[model samples]
Target: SRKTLVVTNDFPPRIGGIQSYLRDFIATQDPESIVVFASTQNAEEAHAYDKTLDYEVIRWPRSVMLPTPTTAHAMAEIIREREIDNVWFGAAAPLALMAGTAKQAGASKVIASTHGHEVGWSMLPGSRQSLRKIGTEVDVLTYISQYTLRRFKSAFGSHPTFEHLPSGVDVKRFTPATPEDKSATRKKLGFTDTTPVIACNSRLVPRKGQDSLIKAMPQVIAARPDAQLLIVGSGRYESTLRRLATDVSQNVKFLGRLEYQDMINTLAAADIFAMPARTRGGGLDVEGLGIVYLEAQACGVPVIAGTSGGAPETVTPATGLVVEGSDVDKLSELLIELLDDPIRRAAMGAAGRAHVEAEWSWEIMGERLTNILQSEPR
Candidate 1:
């Protein structure tokens, strides 16, 4: 049963998009067959968290890991001892440098995964050289979206064994709110049953475009005065976002960070989901692919995504609209239109649920990953 070694700097009790992503991907595998080699957030916290899981999670004392000789030596020892067949990099880049060592230690295949940051690496000088070197070392390279694949092609300039593996959502966990629960949840959340709820469930950061949603609420309220913009999650941008929401305070509510169950319930009670994430700091700050869009769709809610990074790829408008996150007027128009048409929202919501189940569920993606891992290089 033991076959794969999950190698990464990202893991739980650390909590970033990549950290959660690696954890979610692990959920798809045979837990008994897996051994995680990752950096520790806190020895006691990580130990406590690892005890909650079914697999073996090995952590070094470091909070972050680089593919130094020491890292390679440790992984090589693990691969030989565990007789690990596949070594999977949860986020490639520097970690991919350990691929040669893993292979030498008898790992049959080494899979390296690329996220948005890797694309940033590809465009730079020293990092681009590092990215190219990592490309040549791994047995398989996985990209999250077409946007990333295209970039990889131009950057690598190699006939690489590339695999497309986008992020997926846990459909079972994120299932739609039943009608009874929807009304009850809305009431519990301090909203009327008929209130038009626009939920933006992501970290309260500028790149996530929560400010644009807040700015648009003034107009959203003018047309649908009963509209309530529910902003969930918390981050460094909260103070600025709170100041911006002051004018339309009646129409906006900052719920801040919430427990996992509470966050899901808040999402379930919403009429529409929006996160106008814009790529700022050049290409440095961008959504590789918005996982929240997929999560919203899984909950049978319509989405409003932004034209940044691979966010547009997450929805097909049968599920939601995609617009420039920086344009407050256009964003407001889209929100107002969705708010006015319940029939359209229902149709989109139903389609979104079906689409997520068919193409983006973790169940389906887990199979895709298994097949990729088992396949021969051609």
Candidate 2:
């Protein structure tokens, strides 16, 4: 087996899509085959995963946002000392700039994985130049979606060896529910059997379009008076979302942040799951892959997504609807249609679960990733 070093600023206890990706991807690899070097948040939070993580992890203080020079030199030293066969950078920013340094030190191959927002950063003056150089220098490169893959080429030009490999979901952990199971879950969450529940799990932000969903709620309630919206997350935009929710306050439940298992239960209990994320700041910020969409699907719940960024890639026509932009009227129409038809919703839900099982399991994607890490240098 190849000895690998995974360098990432994003990891668990730090919440977000990339952090989840880092954790799940690392879980797929053998502990003995890989070592992790990550930036520390706090001693307690940093050590929280020590009992769960089977591999060795080294935490560096104040290096994630510091000058690249400091982290780069330290990473080079680690690569040389460990005789790392491959060095993986979680994102193509500060750490990826050290690809050349790592290669010079001793790493046989260097990989830079690009998530969604970083593609926009590649268009900035300084970042474009540095990332372009890093893009050409790295031995292998991967993207989370075709949307980001397109943005990357448009921003930094195309590379010969780039591939699109999305983050994966655990099918077993996020599986579909039976009618009886759904009823029990609803009861456990303090919802009536007849209540129409729409679940939205994401950070409270403009790009996520939670406000648009809230904006559509009056229309949703008009048609289905018993409709309940579960907004599960917290962010800087909490004030804005709360202000917007005042019109339909009673129907909206701000389910702050939920523990992992609780979140799975919430997704499974909902009749429909939607997060109509829109592109913000001229595409500078957007969903890279929208892992929650997949998670909901894995739970056998149909989803509603915006036709912006990588979210469109997360759902299909048979499984869900992608609203053009964050059109509130379109979202309202889609929600009303799905909420009104139990048979259609059930079919979509089953299709979504089947879709995830067939194509998006972490076992499948993780096996592919393991093969990539174990492959000879291209």
Candidate 3:
């Protein structure tokens, strides 16, 4: 029988880190055992994506769902109909306020997930009150990183159990390139084995610090002329990043939004991976979920992440370096140094692969999810 009802506004056909995180989180469970409740985005596109997924999604007609009494009544009906024991709020906020309704409808547990946005929600006096109140209603609090856990603890104050559930990478697909795989992909990109390539594969967004990576390239190229920066993915900020790369445009290639297999190959072709992320809104804005750093690590490439948000937590010691997202000089220097030291990079890459296998794979993450959802609410 189905056991989990994942409630959230952040689901596909929306494109986002949280959407991917929530989707992969669901993948950990049996498809036959899940019923998702999500806000609808493009009905046609959502249809295509849902067909690709194993579970059934009950898309609300609207683009957003709040915790109104009518919504609670609707949720309870599903809980009763499916014998749902676990009610998971995919992105906790106002929706998690429905925890009381889920329990009243006979659900055994209500899980509310926390992300980078929630960290900002907790910092404000108003939303902090709302978040603290939701903290008490849910059976468990799940955080993507230790940094988010610490912030939630400051607001939640140790009532319900908090679970460290990182969104895991597709270890099988993102694995270290076989020499042949590497050679072929490098050939596709017209890269020689000796060329030093640094890659950043996130949406071309300001917060992601793609501009900083572009800014740092002048120094990187000065140190290593054969150096190249491969940027993938696209967003509204693409034009801004392109403008920033004007001076060092030759060294930076904005390979706008690659297809899936190509993107994976792009990651495997790189020597070093970086995302010099920074924050905004008085540090309330940060990259809280799925630091693509994990993917690069899974690909057996050394990583360099920003000091912002929960970034550094994903970087295992000796596996990568973390620097301020805004510091052009430091990022440039680190990139050049890592590029020049191939042996150190190889060792770090090897360690990164091991670390992902041990801790950040979906198999491991699924176990953590199962434990938290079924664990006693002490």
Candidate 4:
């Protein structure tokens, strides 16, 4: 019967993996067991989403990006007023520092999570010191992928305890499409059954390797004249990806962002799901676990990922292909092979769906998280 307060800078009305992960994570917890402290994008949107949650949600100014005494004081006051027993930070740094402040003001236990992308940012001059303080003060630290855990140790030395917990997918909601469903979806999207549709769903960022996929498309289309690439999601790299697509093949379509449910259908209609994300700026920006891969797999679509950061962890040989993100030749080869062999793609899709059902459902992850939070600290 612990009373927990989940503090996160990321939330819905905002889009991204971390935002989605935090929303799903809270959804798994008991309504009566938790409360949320979230950042605001728009007051009206925050208010709208807040009403949907079973527990009370307190919104704060997100403009104050760094941990300051003012932010800490506000969080501390909430902890004291609510008699919160557990304070869980969605990410390290500022929130962890806030957790430390609440601890000083007498919250019993403090925990923080680290996703891959934040490690480098957390290590910059002023932030590094605060991150180190959080590293020492936090009672438990959780990581989304092994890559993140490894990087965190190198950046901040050892912690008392570290747990590796990848984000979960909603298996039932993202299962394979029936033949009728697939045919209808494709027709609606203006594609024929013979077209080889490749779905690349992610933020169109440099590290995501969309450019490599675009680079590979001309090669794919030369071999299979009917091949089509659907690039979903929006980001800073859209124009760059569009420009790359123009020179290569007219078959590449930049779909921009789509609603969540529409994305599910698009993945179902895809012949293959690809995101060849390579590391950029040494390792500063990279994919963490690539939940989009899992969602695609959950929908019974085969995947092709870059062998960089945590993308490898989200896929297996039986489910899809993992190639070096920078290697356009390898990516082109894999796409051609998958598109050419219906039997292979079908087998991989079935295997991927089975894998997700057995191991990656949000329900399974929720139970694991509950145990981690309840277990005695080492």
Among the numbered candidates, top TM-score falls to 1
lDDT: worst 10-residue window of model 4: 151-160
In the range 1-378, model 2's lDDT, one tens digit per residue, is 888898888877788778888888888888888888888887787888765778988788863644277787888788877778999988767677778788888888888788765776767888778778877778778888888877767555555378667888899999887678779878887887898999999988888888889999998999998899999999999998899899898899998999988888888989999998887887677778888899999998989987668999999988988886357677889999999899999999899998988889998788878877899987
Tens-digit lDDT track of model 3 for 1-378 = 328899888997788877988888788887878899888868888888889887899877776788888888888998999889889999888799899889999998889988777877777899888888888888788888887787768786565688888789889989899888888888888887787888899987788888888888888888888899998999999888888889887788889999988998889879999887887767776777545898999999999988777898888777889888778898988888888788999999999989888988999998888787666655
lDDT string, candidate 4, 106-211, tens digits: 7777888887655775557776666677778888788888887776665544653677768999998898998898998899889978889999998888988888
**Local distance difference test values of all predictions, in order:** 0.86, 0.84, 0.85, 0.82
A best-first ranking of the candidates according to their lDDT comes to 1, 3, 2, 4
| TM value for model 2 | 0.89
Better of 2 and 3 by TM-score: 3
* Stretches of model 1 off by over 4 angstroms after superposition: 61-63, 157-159
Candidate 3 Cα lDDT to native? 0.85
Q: How far is candidate 2 from the true structure (C-alpha RMSD, Å)?
A: 2.7
Give candidate 2's error at residue 327 in angstroms: 3.2
Best by lDDT: 1
Q: Which model is ahead, 1 or 3, in terms of lDDT?
A: 1
- Model 2 residue runs over 4 Å out of place are 12-17, 40-52, 59-81, 158-160
